[PDB]
Design a protein around this ligand. Structure first.
Ligand code: GA8
Ligand code: CL
Ligand code: CL
Ligand code: NA
Lengths: 99, 99
């Protein structure tokens, strides 16, 4: 699809069998999701944003569908204000910016 | 142009007579620039993201040139770690997300 930016670019994602809303975010290097349970081991990561830094749990090789497109990759879980789909998964679904 | 998302989508902007590098950020509602002077009236605002909120100065009706394309809109100025071109100006240059 072609998504204009007059409203927030929100899509539905599916992770863990559950549908959630998330923001397609070209300014996020990584994907960050609100607290939820994911399988496997996690690793620590600190990420920075506008207001400072937060600690997140890094889960690798997680199956996730984004607007109907299948991806398998890293998901960070932590106290983000909104679910964010970052460039690591935007590239898996073939997204580009165009003007 | 078509910008892929393998790396951060950075572009050159011209704002207030200055050249800056900035991130094309579909996850940002508004445009946020590091500390600089701009002419005209402003009012204080709080904006929030990962890590919490920062205080900015809101300037309305500011002309920017973004990768060669002129726009006008609100610009927020304050202690952002990265210069951000948000949706309020991405719309004006015709930027879309495509996949
Ligand atoms: C109302 O207008 C706005 C309100 C909020 C914002 S925001 O900057 O808070 N943000 C809103 C989102 C969180 C809903 C836009 C977002 O694109 C932001 C845009 C952004 C980008 C970078 C920094 C601050 C904000 N990016 C990140 O928050 C973000 C997310 C994940 C990661 C990073 C940034 C990366 N952060 C980073 O490099 O931080 C340093 C620069 C401090 C080391 C680390 C890898 S993972 C912008 C405009
Ligand atoms: Cl505006
Ligand atoms: Cl349009
Ligand atoms: Na003004």
């Amino acid at each position: 699809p072609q998504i204009t930016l007059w409203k927030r670019p929100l899509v539905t994602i599916k992770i863990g069998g559950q549908l959630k809303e998330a923001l397609l975010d070209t300014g996020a290097d990584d994907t960050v999701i609100e607290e939820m349970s994911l399988p496997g081991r996690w690793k620590p990561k600190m990420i920075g944003g506008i207001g400072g830094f937060i600690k997140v749990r890094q889960y690798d090789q997680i199956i996730i569908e984004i607007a109907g497109h299948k991806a398998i990759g890293t998901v960070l879980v932590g106290p983000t204000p909104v679910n964010i789909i970052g460039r690591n998964l935007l590239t898996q679904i073939g997204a580009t910016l165009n003007f």
